[PDB]
Amino acid sequence: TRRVAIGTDHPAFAIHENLILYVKEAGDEFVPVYCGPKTAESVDYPDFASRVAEMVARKEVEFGVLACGSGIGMSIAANKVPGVRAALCHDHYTAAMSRIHNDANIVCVGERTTGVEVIREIIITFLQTPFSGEERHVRRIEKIRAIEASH
Amino acid sequence: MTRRVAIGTDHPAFAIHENLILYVKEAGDEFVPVYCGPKTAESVDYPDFASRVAEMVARKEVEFGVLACGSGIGMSIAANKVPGVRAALCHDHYTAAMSRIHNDANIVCVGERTTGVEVIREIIITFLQTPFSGEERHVRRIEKIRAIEASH
Amino acid sequence: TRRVAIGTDHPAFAIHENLILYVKEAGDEFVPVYCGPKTAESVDYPDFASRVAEMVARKEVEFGVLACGSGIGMSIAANKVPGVRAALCHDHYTAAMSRIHNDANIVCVGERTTGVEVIREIIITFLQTPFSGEERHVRRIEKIRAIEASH
Amino acid sequence: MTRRVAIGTDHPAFAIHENLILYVKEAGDEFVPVYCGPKTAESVDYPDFASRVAEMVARKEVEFGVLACGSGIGMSIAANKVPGVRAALCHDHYTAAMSRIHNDANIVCVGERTTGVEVIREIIITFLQTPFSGEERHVRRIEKIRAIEASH
Ligand SMILES: O=C(NO)[C@H](O)[C@H](O)COP(=O)(O)O
Ligand SMILES: O=C(NO)[C@H](O)[C@H](O)COP(=O)(O)O
Ligand SMILES: O=C(NO)[C@H](O)[C@H](O)COP(=O)(O)O
Ligand SMILES: O=C(NO)[C@H](O)[C@H](O)COP(=O)(O)O
């Protein structure tokens, strides 16, 4: 069982059931946990970025999915939480490499920037692709953890 | 009155480092590049250079940063670990503009392996030239990012 | 007055009024002419690609806008009409350069690939950006016309 | 039983021409690159090389073509002028896959100025390896493209 927490702001609300669906499409072991808004009225992305990022950091869930206008807001605010490696992806390549090289634990996408079928592909690829485990990446990821600790 | 812009890369982006320097100048006379990346070909660790540039931005030694890696991802994660930093992974003109308009982003991140140099150029120029909107919901949202930083 | 004919298939139907709106947003001189489907049921992209491309070729309208799943189908089928330079754009850069270098007369976009705000930006940039008029491009565009004539 | 793949570029894509050759091989043993672009640095006219490769595909001398220019656009326009050709401008994995699945595309077009080499690699590989679906609505739509060609 690999839980994936889902967060959005208002531009991504209309596509939230899509994101739920795309998590389950990655495999039966992938369980979506919807932590986004309940209504379509404006909300502030940091509020929902924080909720999902804290769950990931605390290890309640293995993965996060965050959507907003461009995904930029989500990736900045999620990365403020220690333990989070939030990757803003715009295609299949960035989704795969975020996992292989960076061991990313949160994938961020933009609703106004990336079509839903590419959002589908991103989410599925992010979840299914393993971290390489290579020495250099393991070292670089540990160096990100050391930047957190120095602050 | 002129605006400093620090540039960092790891090894795959080293091959285009004078490109990055050039594109910063291309945004206007008032933009001064500050090269902080691998002085040479050397395979290096992106978080070391993201930190160098991220710290300069957070200390207000430069106004903006430009970071390049393979996909841009490692640079955006590592730079966002520094409080005071809003580092945006951009891949086209629209994200470069909106990162500024909505998020008041102070670091632009790009991948050399994903995004062609003429779009990287367009990203950098758009980033540097586009102003923050100052609009109420955006200020409040940026403050909420700061409040998150304060809690950790 | 610069008429712009608009064509879609079914995945782009839900966003057809968007495309109408984005044409007018480029300027008051830009007049949208909707030539896409009236209902959301499946249709074949070549049918609507051809209608718009023929209007452009015959010079009824100055410009075309075509949307489908990925935009690939639209750009292949529209380019089959002599006189058409249909450019599949996915960002601002490709929209600008399609006009500056290629003198493109039709812009093609994918609904499932490119978010509407980037589709907005593409359409506005395509319409507002002039052809450079440079010798080399004028020569290359004339060489495209010579490929048509040899078939 | 092995599948030939002709490659053409103009001048900005010349710098990555052995990349393109390499990536075609990377899709499998059964893929044979056929280099047809500028043998040298020379500033050239994209329609001359789009034609060379487009004609080889239409004559069935090769099964696939790969075309690279600045933005990929001029290559897709010029190659689509040859009857029998379905040339797709792709910029990521999804368009590369769908061009094959839905449109049975026989030429892949890319921009060196817009799309980074590792994604160009991914585009080429995905294009070559992904099969046409053969599904009814797609066959009919492809035939309608042919019927358009016949009318001119
Ligand atoms: O894209 C975003 N953050 O990156 C936000 O979703 C975006 O600013 C929301 O904008 P809006 O409040 O005009 O809808
Ligand atoms: O993509 C990146 N960071 O996100 C880095 O540039 C990447 O890890 C470099 O990988 P390499 O060590 O295979 O060159
Ligand atoms: O993207 C397209 N042509 O490029 C078409 O819109 C696409 O094949 C439509 O697919 P569908 O018939 O499964 O909706
Ligand atoms: O983008 C292209 N065709 O679409 C071409 O590579 C482009 O016209 C080359 O332009 P240049 O003549 O400035 O190098």
Side-chain angles (χ1 to χ4, degrees):
Chain A
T1 305
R2 311 170 76 168
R3 278 160 205 72
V4 183
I6 305 167
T8 75
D9 58 359
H10 53 287
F13 172 84
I15 66 148
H16 80 272
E17 297 187 54
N18 286 223
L19 313 175
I20 288 158
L21 174 58
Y22 303 155
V23 173
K24 308 187 195 201
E25 265 182 309
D28 314 318
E29 80 270 31
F30 292 106
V31 183
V33 188
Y34 183 66
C35 304
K38 295 299 204 57
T39 73
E41 39 182 292
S42 186
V43 292
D44 302 325
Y45 63 85
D47 290 341
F48 295 87
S50 185
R51 193 177 187 168
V52 168
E54 301 296 347
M55 296 168 79
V56 171
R58 285 185 304 252
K59 321 263 283 179
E60 287 183 69
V61 303
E62 188 181 357
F63 289 119
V65 173
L66 287 166
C68 66
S70 67
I72 290 158
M74 284 308 185
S75 80
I76 295 160
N79 274 316
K80 298 304 177 175
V81 181
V84 173
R85 290 183 296 281
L88 173 50
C89 299
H90 62 279
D91 71 339
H92 170 281
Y93 181 91
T94 42
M97 292 310 102
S98 81
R99 299 291 299 110
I100 299 162
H101 284 197
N102 305 292
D103 201 19
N105 51 39
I106 298 191
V107 54
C108 307
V109 291
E111 187 272 343
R112 301 168 171 153
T113 58
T114 302
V116 309
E117 293 322 302
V118 175
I119 288 172
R120 172 183 191 273
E121 188 182 65
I122 290 155
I123 287 172
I124 291 172
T125 305
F126 190 83
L127 294 170
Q128 296 187 345
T129 311
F131 176 50
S132 57
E134 256 101 286
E135 191 185 348
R136 62 196 192 276
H137 310 127
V138 174
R139 187 176 68 253
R140 286 151 198 180
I141 298 152
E142 180 57 67
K143 291 186 169 151
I144 302 177
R145 197 168 292 120
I147 305 163
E148 288 163 1
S150 58
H151 297 283
Chain B
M1 56 139 195
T2 79
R3 333 213 206 169
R4 309 177 85 217
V5 192
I7 297 151
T9 102
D10 59 348
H11 52 293
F14 160 76
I16 63 150
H17 79 87
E18 289 170 65
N19 289 254
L20 302 178
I21 294 158
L22 175 53
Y23 307 154
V24 164
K25 298 169 154 136
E26 296 204 80
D29 276 3
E30 83 272 23
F31 295 104
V32 194
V34 178
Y35 184 66
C36 294
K39 301 255 213 167
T40 40
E42 63 181 325
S43 167
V44 295
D45 293 339
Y46 65 89
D48 300 329
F49 296 89
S51 184
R52 189 175 161 99
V53 172
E55 300 289 348
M56 302 161 73
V57 172
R59 279 193 259 292
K60 298 156 169 282
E61 289 162 6
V62 305
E63 194 197 350
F64 295 111
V66 173
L67 292 174
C69 65
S71 59
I73 295 184
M75 287 299 190
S76 80
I77 299 175
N80 278 313
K81 298 311 167 159
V82 178
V85 167
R86 287 173 305 278
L89 188 38
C90 305
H91 60 273
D92 68 340
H93 171 273
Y94 175 93
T95 51
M98 300 306 159
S99 79
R100 298 296 299 119
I101 299 169
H102 283 191
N103 316 291
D104 197 19
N106 52 23
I107 303 194
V108 68
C109 301
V110 305
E112 190 271 352
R113 296 303 165 180
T114 43
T115 314
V117 310
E118 300 310 318
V119 174
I120 287 177
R121 177 182 176 277
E122 178 195 64
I123 287 156
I124 285 164
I125 298 174
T126 310
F127 190 83
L128 292 168
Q129 297 182 339
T130 308
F132 174 51
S133 59
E135 278 173 52
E136 171 134 42
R137 66 194 188 286
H138 302 145
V139 175
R140 189 191 54 238
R141 279 156 204 170
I142 299 163
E143 182 56 38
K144 289 178 172 193
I145 299 159
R146 209 163 289 124
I148 298 181
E149 276 171 358
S151 75
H152 294 281
Chain C
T1 305
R2 311 170 76 168
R3 278 160 205 72
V4 183
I6 305 167
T8 75
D9 58 359
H10 53 287
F13 172 84
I15 66 148
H16 80 272
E17 297 187 54
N18 286 223
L19 313 175
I20 288 158
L21 174 58
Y22 303 155
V23 173
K24 308 187 195 201
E25 265 182 309
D28 314 318
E29 80 270 31
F30 292 106
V31 183
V33 188
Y34 183 66
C35 304
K38 295 299 204 57
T39 73
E41 39 182 292
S42 186
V43 292
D44 302 325
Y45 63 85
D47 290 341
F48 295 87
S50 185
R51 193 177 187 168
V52 168
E54 301 296 347
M55 296 168 79
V56 171
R58 285 185 304 252
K59 321 263 283 179
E60 287 183 69
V61 303
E62 188 181 357
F63 289 119
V65 173
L66 287 166
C68 66
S70 67
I72 290 158
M74 284 308 185
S75 80
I76 295 160
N79 274 316
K80 298 304 177 175
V81 181
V84 173
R85 290 183 296 281
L88 173 50
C89 299
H90 62 279
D91 71 339
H92 170 281
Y93 181 91
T94 42
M97 292 310 102
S98 81
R99 299 291 299 110
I100 299 162
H101 284 197
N102 305 292
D103 201 19
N105 51 39
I106 298 191
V107 54
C108 307
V109 291
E111 187 272 343
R112 301 168 171 153
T113 58
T114 302
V116 309
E117 293 322 302
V118 175
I119 288 172
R120 172 183 191 273
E121 188 182 65
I122 290 155
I123 287 172
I124 291 172
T125 305
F126 190 83
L127 294 170
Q128 296 187 345
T129 311
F131 176 50
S132 57
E134 256 101 286
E135 191 185 348
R136 62 196 192 276
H137 310 127
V138 174
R139 187 176 68 253
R140 286 151 198 180
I141 298 152
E142 180 57 67
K143 291 186 169 151
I144 302 177
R145 197 168 292 120
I147 305 163
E148 288 163 1
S150 58
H151 297 283
Chain D
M1 56 139 195
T2 79
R3 333 213 206 169
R4 309 177 85 217
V5 192
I7 297 151
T9 102
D10 59 348
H11 52 293
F14 160 76
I16 63 150
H17 79 87
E18 289 170 65
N19 289 254
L20 302 178
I21 294 158
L22 175 53
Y23 307 154
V24 164
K25 298 169 154 136
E26 296 204 80
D29 276 3
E30 83 272 23
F31 295 104
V32 194
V34 178
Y35 184 66
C36 294
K39 301 255 213 167
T40 40
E42 63 181 325
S43 167
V44 295
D45 293 339
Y46 65 89
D48 300 329
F49 296 89
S51 184
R52 189 175 161 99
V53 172
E55 300 289 348
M56 302 161 73
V57 172
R59 279 193 259 292
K60 298 156 169 282
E61 289 162 6
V62 305
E63 194 197 350
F64 295 111
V66 173
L67 292 174
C69 65
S71 59
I73 295 184
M75 287 299 190
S76 80
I77 299 175
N80 278 313
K81 298 311 167 159
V82 178
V85 167
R86 287 173 305 278
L89 188 38
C90 305
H91 60 273
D92 68 340
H93 171 273
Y94 175 93
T95 51
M98 300 306 159
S99 79
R100 298 296 299 119
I101 299 169
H102 283 191
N103 316 291
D104 197 19
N106 52 23
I107 303 194
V108 68
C109 301
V110 305
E112 190 271 352
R113 296 303 165 180
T114 43
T115 314
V117 310
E118 300 310 318
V119 174
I120 287 177
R121 177 182 176 277
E122 178 195 64
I123 287 156
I124 285 164
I125 298 174
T126 310
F127 190 83
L128 292 168
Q129 297 182 339
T130 308
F132 174 51
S133 59
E135 278 173 52
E136 171 134 42
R137 66 194 188 286
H138 302 145
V139 175
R140 189 191 54 238
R141 279 156 204 170
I142 299 163
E143 182 56 38
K144 289 178 172 193
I145 299 159
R146 209 163 289 124
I148 298 181
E149 276 171 358
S151 75
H152 294 281

